[PDB]
Amino acid sequence: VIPYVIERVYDIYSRLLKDRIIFLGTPIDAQVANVVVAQLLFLDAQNPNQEIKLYINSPGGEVDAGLAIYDTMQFVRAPVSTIVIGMAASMAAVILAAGEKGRRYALPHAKVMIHQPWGGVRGTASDIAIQAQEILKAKKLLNEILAKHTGQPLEKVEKDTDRDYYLSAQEALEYGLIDQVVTREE
Amino acid sequence: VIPYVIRVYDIYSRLLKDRIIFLGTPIDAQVANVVVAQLLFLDAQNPNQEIKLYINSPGGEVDAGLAIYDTMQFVRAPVSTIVIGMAASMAAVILAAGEKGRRYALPHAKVMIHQPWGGVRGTASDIAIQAQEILKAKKLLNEILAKHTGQPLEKVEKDTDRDYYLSAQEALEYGLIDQVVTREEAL
Amino acid sequence: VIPYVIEYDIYSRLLKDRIIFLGTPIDAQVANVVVAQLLFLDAQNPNQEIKLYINSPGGEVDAGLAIYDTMQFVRAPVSTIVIGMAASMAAVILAAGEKGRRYALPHAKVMIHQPWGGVRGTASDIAIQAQEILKAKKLLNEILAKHTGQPLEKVEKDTDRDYYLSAQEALEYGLIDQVVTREE
Amino acid sequence: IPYVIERVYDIYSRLLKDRIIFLGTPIDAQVANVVVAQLLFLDAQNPNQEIKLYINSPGGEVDAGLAIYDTMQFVRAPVSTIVIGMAASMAAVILAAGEKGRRYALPHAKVMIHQPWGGVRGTASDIAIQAQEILKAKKLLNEILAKHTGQPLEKVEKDTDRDYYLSAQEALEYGLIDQVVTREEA
Amino acid sequence: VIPYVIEQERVYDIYSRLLKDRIIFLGTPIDAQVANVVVAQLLFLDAQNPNQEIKLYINSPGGEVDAGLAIYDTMQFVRAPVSTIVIGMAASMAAVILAAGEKGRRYALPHAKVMIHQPWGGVRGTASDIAIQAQEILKAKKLLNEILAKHTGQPLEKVEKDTDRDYYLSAQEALEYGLIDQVVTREE
Amino acid sequence: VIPYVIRVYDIYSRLLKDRIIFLGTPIDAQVANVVVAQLLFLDAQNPNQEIKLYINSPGGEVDAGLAIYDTMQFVRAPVSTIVIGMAASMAAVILAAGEKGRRYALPHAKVMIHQPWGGVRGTASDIAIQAQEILKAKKLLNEILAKHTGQPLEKVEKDTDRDYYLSAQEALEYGLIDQVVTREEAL
Amino acid sequence: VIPYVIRVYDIYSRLLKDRIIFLGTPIDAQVANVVVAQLLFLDAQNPNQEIKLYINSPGGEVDAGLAIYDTMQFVRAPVSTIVIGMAASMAAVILAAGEKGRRYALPHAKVMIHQPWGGVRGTASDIAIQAQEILKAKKLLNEILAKHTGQPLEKVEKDTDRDYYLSAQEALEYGLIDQVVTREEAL
Amino acid sequence: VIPYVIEQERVYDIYSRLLKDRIIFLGTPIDAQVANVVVAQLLFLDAQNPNQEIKLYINSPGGEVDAGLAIYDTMQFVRAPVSTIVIGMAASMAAVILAAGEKGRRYALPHAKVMIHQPWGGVRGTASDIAIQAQEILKAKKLLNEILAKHTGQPLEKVEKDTDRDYYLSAQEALEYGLIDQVVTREE
Amino acid sequence: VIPYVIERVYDIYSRLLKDRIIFLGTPIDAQVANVVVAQLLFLDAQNPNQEIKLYINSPGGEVDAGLAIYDTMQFVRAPVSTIVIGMAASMAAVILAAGEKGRRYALPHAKVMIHQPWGGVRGTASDIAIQAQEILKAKKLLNEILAKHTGQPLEKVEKDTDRDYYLSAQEALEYGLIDQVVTREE
Amino acid sequence: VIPYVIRVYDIYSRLLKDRIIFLGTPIDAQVANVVVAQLLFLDAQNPNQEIKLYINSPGGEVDAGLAIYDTMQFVRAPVSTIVIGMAASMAAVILAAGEKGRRYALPHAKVMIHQPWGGVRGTASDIAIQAQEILKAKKLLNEILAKHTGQPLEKVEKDTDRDYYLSAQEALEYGLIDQVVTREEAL
C-alpha cells in the first residue's frame, strides 16, 4: 500500500526521486542493484553537479549486486550523500561508507554492522576450489574497500569483520564509516 | 479494497494531502521506509505545520520502529500521535514519542509495552554477539520509554518484563499519552 | 469484478454520497480504512449524516472498538443500517449508530456474543492474556447495555453464547430503532 | 535397539529384569503409562527391593509427569532416581521425587526447573477456566518442589519464573538430588 | 517497487525513461522472454535512429544458449552500434553478449566480474533421443568458443581450454583477455 | 518488467504499431488467439502492407499452431517470418508458412521439426479415437511441411520421426526459409 | 537390512556379546540412552573386562554426548575408543575420553573439534538465559578436551573457534588418541 | 520382500545365511550406517576365523568419502583376506573398495562396470568456514588418488588426470587398469 | 499380506525357494538384483547340478542391475530355467531370453517386450558427452546379448528395439526369446 | 488387524492349509505373483485336490490378471471360484475361468464386465504402439469371456462396451458362474 501525491501524479518514492532522493530499503540482489543504478544514472544525467541523497535501511545482500551500486556511486559525477535510517549491514554498510566524504550520516539509533561474506559451493572438488577462491577474493576486496573509506588499517578491518561487528551510530562515526550523527533538523 | 476521491486519490493518499499518516500494520523495514518517506515529504512541504500519525499496530521490528522514532525526532514539523485501536511494543514507543501535549488516545484504545523478542542461531560465538544486541535493544527501549513518560528507569524495566497492558486512562497516568479524547468539540 | 462510474469504483462513488460499507470480517486494516472514511467525511462536513451499511460477521475487538470510538468521536451523526448480518463486534457498531437512525432490512440479522480468543505461553503470560480478554468481555457488555438500554446483568447473560435476533427482535432488544421494508 | 540372549531381550527389557527403568524421552501420556506399568510390575515382583529410574528427558505434559510422580510415591519399593544427561521441568520434578538419599546425578548432568506452559483458544469463559487450571498447576508444582528440596516456597516460586538451570553440584545445593556420583566406587 | 518519472504529459517507469535515452538493461538470467524483450528494444531504438549509439548495461549470470544468441545476433543485425557495459556480473551467455559489443565500446566498472565456461544442460529419454540432445550441446559448446575467440582475438584452442571449468575474470583481466576495451572508474 | 514508450505503449504494443508481431513463447490456445487477433487487426488496417512475425518459440499445441498457420494463409497481407533464437515443431511449421521469399533466419537461429506428442487415458474405445486423431495430425503436419518446403512427403516423414535439428543454413537447404540474414539491409 | 547371527542376534547384538558397542550415528538423547544402557549392562556383566566403543559419528547434542562421557568415566570397566571413519565434536570428546592408552584411530579416520552450535527464540530475558548456558557448555567442553589431551586450555579455546580437522596422525599429536593402528594385532 | 532359510532350528534371511558362508554384500549407496554394518560384519567374520577368506560382493554407486574409507581401513585392519567381486557397478568409493581387495582376489563379472572420479561435496557459510571445507575436500581428492595409485600400480599423475571427470571402465578395461585381477565368466 | 506355511515356518516365497524357485516379480533396481543374485548363489552352492526356476513378471529396470542378474545366471553351474508369467519387458526380457537353452518358457497369454534403453543426463557438455557414450555402449551391448540368445542377426535386433517391440508368447517363441509356450501341466 | 491360530498362523495362512486362496484386493503384479505362488504350491502338494479361490475384487491390471488366469489353466488341480461381494473386470474373467461346474456366487454378490482401461503418453509413433496393445487386450479379453461363458463373441463385445453389471442369478444365466449358493446344506 503506497500513497500518492500530485504536482502530475507520483507515488511517494517517485515524488522523492524528483527531489534527488533514492531509497535502498530492501535486501540487495541484482534487481535491487539495477533499479538503484538506474536512478543514480538518471539523476546524474539530469544534473551532474547536484547532490543525490541515498537513504539506507537494509541488511545487505549479494556482493556483486552491492558492488554495482558502489561502483556507480564512485562513477557518477554527482556527489552521493548517504544516510542510514534504521540499519546498514554488510554490503549496505559498505555502501553507506562509500558516500561522499563529509556527507555520510546516521540517525542516532541507527545501526551499522560489518562482517565477512557468506556463500555456498556445491560440485566436484575442482569446482569447489574455483568458487572458494572467488569468495576469498571477495572477502579481501570488501576489507580493502572498507579500509579505504574508513581510513582504518586493513589489518584492523580484517580482524573486526571476522564475525558480526555491530556499531552504534556514534561508534560508526569513530570507526570512520560515517561523518556525522544527525539528531534534529536545522 | 481501498476507496477513491477525485486528480485521483486513494483514501490514505487523500488524507496524506491533509498531513495525516497511518501506521496501521505490524512494523517491518518496508513499513518504516514508507512512513519515514511520508514524514520527510510532509516536513519538506511545511516544517511548521503539524503532522498527525494515527496508530493501530501491534509493533514489530526494533530497528524499523527506531527509524520511525528517529525521523519523528529529526523533522522540524511537530508529529502528533493518536492511537485508535492498539499501540503495542514498538508502536507504543512511537506513540509515546509524539510531540509532548499532542499524544492522544480514543477512549477504548489499548497500549502495551514489553521487552523485545528475538531469535539467535549459530555457534556459541555468534550467539553471544546476537545476545548482546538484544540486550542493548532492551535497555535502550526502556530508556526511551522512561525519557518520554517521565517514569524512573527502574520502574519501566520492571513494568516491561512481561506484557504490560494499559487502558487509555492508565496510559495517560503512566505518561505515555497526554489526553484521552472522546468527542470532537473537546479539541 | 467491482464496477466503475464516471462523473470512481462503486464504493468510492457511494462515498461521495457519504455512504460507507462495513461488509467484511473486521481486522485492523478494515478498521483503519473505515476510520479513515469517517474522518474524511466528518472533515468535509461535520453536520451532515454519514450512513454506515453493515454486513459483517464481526472480528477483532480492538479493531471493532476503533470504529466504535471514531463514530462517537466525529461530530457528524453516523446512521447505521444492517443489510444481511451484523454479528459480534459488527452488532456493537450497529447498536452504536446515532439513536433514532439505526435501521435493519426485514430479513437482516443481528447476533451478539462474548469475545473469543487464544493464548499461548507460560502460566504467567496466560494469566495476563486471560485478564485482558476478561476486561474486554466486561467492556463490550457495558457498551451494549448502554446503547440498548438493557440492564447490564441481562446483556451479560444473553451474550454467554451466540444470541441471534431477527430484525424485529433486535428492535425490541434496543439494538436498532426501525425495521425498514420499503423506501417510500 | 540391540538384543541379548540368555529367551531374547532388547537391552531395555534386559535392564528391566534388573529393576532398571529408563525415562529417556519427552513425557506424554503414553510415556507415563508405560513407566507406571513398569513401576507397578517391579513393585509387585518385590515391594522391598530398590527400583532404579534413569532420567534423560526435557520434561513434558504435567498430568503425565504427575502420574509418574504419584506412582513413585504410591509403590512400596524405593525408587532411586539418576539423571544422566538432562532432567528438565516435569523430569526435574520426577528426579527430585526419588527416595530421599537415593537421588543421584552424573557430574555433567543438567537439571532445569521452570513454571508450566500451555495454550487455549475459545471464548473468554473457556479461557478463564483454562487459565485457572494452569495457575493451579503452577502452584502445585512449586509446592511439590518445595517439599522435596526443602526450599521455602517463596524461593521456588521466584526461581521457576523463567528457565532455571542447575549443574549437578548446584542441584545438590538446591536439594533436588542427594549426591553427585563420579565413579562406581561408592 | 519501480519508481516513475513524469515527462522528462508522459509517465515513464525508470527503465522506460532510460530507454528514451537509448539505454537497455540486461539485468536478469537469460531466457526466451528476456531475450525477446531485449531484441524488441534493440529493434525499436535502431528504427528510431540507426546511426546513434545504443547502451546495453549488463548484470546477469547468463542463461539459455538460444536466447543469448538471439540477443547476440540482433546486436550484429541492427545498424546502430551497441555499446556494452558490465555492472556487477556478466557470466556465461552474458559474457558472450558483453564481448559482442561494438569494438572500442565494451566497458566494465572497476569491480565488475566476467565469467566464461562451457554450456550446461540435461536430457531424459531413449538412447536415440539422448544422442540427438548430446550432439546439439556439443555443437553449442564449439560455437560459443568460436564466437568468444572471434570477439576477443584469442586463439580458439586457448578459449576451449579456459572455458572447460568456470573461468572468472576481474575487470582488468577481462580487458587483457580481450572481452572488453576499457575499465571506467569515473565519469569523464 | 516490460518497458513503455510514448500515448502509452509497452514495447510490444509499440512494435505492433509498426506491423510487427512476436511469437516468443510456447504455443497454447491463449497464445494463438492473441497472435490471430493481431494478424486480423493489422490486415484490417491495411491488407496490402507486409506484416513481420518474429519467432522464438519451442512450439506447442497442434490446434493452436494451426490456427496461427491458417490465419496467416487467410489474411491478404503478406506475412514475413523471422526466426530469432529457435523455431521448433509448430513454430517451425509457422516459420516455413511465411510468404514465399520472405522467410528469414538470423545466423545462429535454430529450427527443429518432429512428429507430434500427446497423451490420453481412458477406455480402449476412447484411446482408439484419440490415437487416430494424433495419427491424422502427424500426417497433416508432414503434408504442410512438404508443401511449404518443396520436399517429398516420404522425406519429411522420415526426417521428423525424431527431433530433427537444423542450423539456419541447413534450414535454408531444407526449404524451411528463403534467406539467412546477418545485417538488416537484407530485408 | 541388518543381518542376523545365531539364539537370534542381529550383527550389533552379536558384537555386543563380545563387549563391543558402536556409536555410529549423530548423537541425540535416544542414541545416548542406548549407549549408556549398553555400557551399564557390560559393566554389570564384568566390571574388569575391557569394553570397545567403535566411533563413526558427526557428534550431536551436548547433553546427550556428556551422558555418554560421564557413563564411561563412571563405570569401572575400562572403555577403549576406536574411531573408524569420523569423530567430530561430541564424538571427538567421547573418543578422547577413552581409557588412557586405549584410544585408537584407523589410518584414514578423521577427528574434528569445534565449539557448540545452538539456537533460541524468545524474549530478551529468555535469550540471555540460553546464551549463558551455551557459554557454559562451550567452556566446559574446552576444559574436558584440555584434560584428556593434556593441552593448555587457551590452546583448545583457540583451536575450537572454527572447525578444526585433524588426520589420525595429527590427532595423535594433539593428544586426542594414543595410537594409530593399521593391523589388528596392535590392540 | 527378503526371503528366509531355515537351518541351512535356525532361521536366516538370505543375507544372514550367506554371511554364515563368510559373504558380505555392499549393494547400496555408501553412508555412515552402511559403512558401520559392513565394518561390523568384517570384524565378526575375522573374529570367527582370521585365516579364512571373506567375500565382499559389490554393487554400489559409491557415497560418502569418510564412510568408504572406514570400510577400506577395516579391510586392511582385519587379518582375514577380503576378496572383492563387482557385480553390476562399483563406482567412486565402491571402486576404491573393489581395488582394495586382496591382491589376486579382486574379480568382476563380465558386464560389470567400474567408474572412478574425484570427490564431490558442498558447503554453505562464511568465507572462513568455506575455506576450511574446501581444504578438506582437496585433501580427500589427493588421498583417494594416492590410494587408487597404490592398489592399481598406476602412476599418481595418470590417476589424477583420469579421475578429473567420470572415468568408466568395462570389466576387461578395469583388469588392464589394475583395479581387479580377473574377469570371471563361469564357475570353475 | 503374505501367507505362511509350515514344514519350520516359511513365508510362501521362502517356501518356494526351498524348492529352488526364485521370483523376479518387480521392477529391477540394485536391491532387487542383489536379492536375486543372493538366491542364485545360495541355490547353486546347495547343489550346482540341480535346476533353478526363475519366474518372471517384471517391467524391467536399471541396466546395470539387470546385467548383474544376467551375469550371475551365466556364472553359476546350476542351469537356470526361465518362465515368464504375465510380463517380461526390457531388462526382464533379456533375463528371460538368458535362461538355459531349451528351458525358457512362457504362459500362453504372457507378454514379452524389447526396446532400447532409456536414460538421463544433467551437467556440463563434457559430462553429458561422457554419459551419452555410456548409454550408447549399453544400447549396443543389450542388442548383442539379445542377438546371441535369440540367434537373430544383430542388425535385425537393432532395428526391432528402436521402439517398444511387443511379442505374444507364440511370437516370442518364433523370435527365439523362449523355447516353449506351456498351456497345461503334464 | 489379521487374527491368528496355533505352529502360528494368520487366518489366511490357516485357510491356505485347507487349500483356500483369497483374491480380495485390486490386482497388480504383486497380487498376481502371490496368488500364482499359492496356486503352484497347492498344486505341487496335491495336483488332484480341489483349490478354492474366493474372489472379492474390482479387477486391475490386465497382464497381472492374465497371469492368474494362465496359472489356473496350467495347474492340474481344479480351481473352484467363489465370488463373495464383487468380481469386476479382470476379477470377473478369473471368476468365469474357474473349473466348469465349480463356479459359485453368494446370492447378493455382483459381477461386472467391461472393456479395458489404459493410458498412453509419448510421440505419435509411441502412442500408436501402445494403442495397438490396448486394442489386442480388449479383443483377447472378449474372446476369453466368450470362451468361458459360451456367449457369441459379438454379444460379449457389445455387452462389455460399457460397465455391464450382473446379479448372481444374471451371471448364472450369462454363463459366468454355475451356481448361486445360499445355504451350506445345499452342497
Curated annotation (Swiss-Prot), chains B, F, G, J:
InterPro entries according to UniProt: ClpP, ClpP/crotonase-like_dom_sf, ClpP/TepA, ClpP_His_AS, ClpP_Ser_AS
Gene Ontology cellular component terms for the protein in this record: cytoplasm; endopeptidase Clp complex
Protein name: ATP-dependent Clp protease proteolytic subunit
Molecular function GO terms recorded: ATP-dependent peptidase activity; ATPase binding; serine-type endopeptidase activity
Catalytic reaction equation(s): Hydrolysis of proteins to small peptides in the presence of ATP and magnesium. alpha-casein is the usual test substrate. In the absence of ATP, only oligopeptides shorter than five residues are hydrolyzed (such as succinyl-Leu-Tyr-|-NHMec, and Leu-Tyr-Leu-|-Tyr-Trp, in which cleavage of the -Tyr-|-Leu- and -Tyr-|-Trp bonds also occurs)
Domain of life per record: Bacteria
Keywords assigned: Cytoplasm, Hydrolase, Protease, Serine protease
Taxonomic lineage from the root: Bacteria, Thermotogati, Deinococcota, Deinococci, Thermales
Family, as annotated: Belongs to the peptidase S14 family.
Keyword Protease on entry: yes
Principal subcellular localisation of the protein: cytoplasm
Swiss-Prot record, chains E, H:
Annotated family: Belongs to the peptidase S14 family.
Subcellular location: Cytoplasm
Quaternary structure, from the entry: Fourteen ClpP subunits assemble into 2 heptameric rings which stack back to back to give a disk-like structure with a central cavity, resembling the structure of eukaryotic proteasomes.
Any single GO CC term annotated in Swiss-Prot or TrEMBL for this entry: cytoplasm
Xref: SUPFAM superfamilies: ClpP/crotonase
HAMAP family documented for this protein: ClpP (MF_00444)
An annotated Gene Ontology molecular function: ATP-dependent peptidase activity
InterPro entries on file: ClpP, ClpP/crotonase-like_dom_sf, ClpP/TepA, ClpP_His_AS, ClpP_Ser_AS
Purpose: Cleaves peptides in various proteins in a process that requires ATP hydrolysis. Has a chymotrypsin-like activity. Plays a major role in the degradation of misfolded proteins.
Protein known as: ATP-dependent Clp protease proteolytic subunit
Catalytic residues as annotated in Swiss-Prot or TrEMBL: S92 (nucleophile), H117
A family per Pfam: CLP_protease
